[model samples]
Target: SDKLNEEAAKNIMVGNRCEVTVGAQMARRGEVAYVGATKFKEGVWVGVKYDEPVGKNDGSVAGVRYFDCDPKYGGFVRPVDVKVGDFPELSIDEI
Candidate 1:
């Protein structure tokens, strides 16, 4: 919690670009669509609208919509795992 507050949470403003790394999954980059405490989790949560269809929900959790994005392109993650900065979208040819 302390680490999250120190490095991630402070910069987690809505509309900021960010990348979320969970476990061993590839870091997922997106926009910060929603930022604040949520009904589903403790403390703060960062709702991301990913540049690619690499997410779980369609900008809603448990029937509540935090933001709008295409299906499989939106998700909610903890601020601890979010790295907010200037991360440009990678083109297909670069992969």
Candidate 2:
């Protein structure tokens, strides 16, 4: 688990920011997969907390479900498929 540990160490900062895209098929509070500047720890973890709550059916807010994950793992545990809705906009500054 050195890879996971290393990745987590590099990206586990509390103030890290990232953009997340949730798939339509993803569960509301289920695990999400992500790819970006930082890496995620093993298992499931919180990737980003949007400034506002995004709805799946409503366009008023972005309904994407992006989550943080380990990039070194090769592939994502969940696939994004949320009706092509807007992706959640996030930055390290927000974290």
Candidate 3:
């Protein structure tokens, strides 16, 4: 299934930084993903959903960092900390 594929490729693990590929396209769920060009170049904020629920307004999951094409340059964004409040219109499950 697509979701399984994405989850497998995402390689998200506890206490590790999340790496995302960057390009002109957007990654669909259950796929090896990255931030699209429209979001990255435009400085638009991106939200990441985890398999597990995390605390609100806390940095527990925020420790996971986002990267463009390189993990070395990837770091956590402050806006990610505002996940719930940042996009109230979208359900947390949609993140």
Candidate 4:
């Protein structure tokens, strides 16, 4: 049966540096802006503030703000998609 991945969410914390991987080529480095239940979904969701403008929202969803960030620089991701750790922003020169 399908279920929400709460294992990672338990370890995730606000302000924790992390990476959200939507796919092999869709990963974004960001900070944990919110970590808990949300109005938009059941269970938990990990909110992020990307280092760059590569997100869907400004930390807000359905007119409710979860955190603060520039436009198109924030998003809400699933716990399974969020990997919390020392994920420093990668510069263009490093690529």
Local distance difference test, each candidate: 0.86, 0.32, 0.29, 0.88
Model 1: which ten-residue window has the lowest total lDDT? 1-10
Candidate 2's C-alpha runs over 4 A off are: 1-10, 24-42, 55-95
Indicate which candidate wins on lDDT: 4
TM-score of model 4 relative to the true fold? 0.88
Better of 3 and 4 by lDDT: 4
lDDT of 2 by residue, 1-95 (tens): 34553454344333333333444433333122333333333443334333334322221113333443332221222112211133344336654
Q: What is the lDDT of candidate 1?
A: 0.86
Per-residue lDDT tens digits of candidate 1, residues 1-95? 46654467777889898889977899989899998877786777889999999999999999988899999999888888899999878667854
Per-residue C-alpha lDDT of model 4 across residues 3-88, encoded as one tens digit per residue? 55678777999999998997675788989999988899888888999999999999899999989999999988789899999999
Which is the better candidate, 1 or 4, if ranked by lDDT? 4
Q: Which RMSD values do the candidates have, in order?
A: 2.2, 13.7, 15.2, 2.4
The positional error of residue 28 in candidate 2, measured at the CA in angstroms, is 14
**Against the true structure, candidate 2 has what lDDT?**
0.32
Is candidate 2 or 3 superior in TM-score? Answer: 2
Per-residue lDDT, model 1, residue 11, is 70
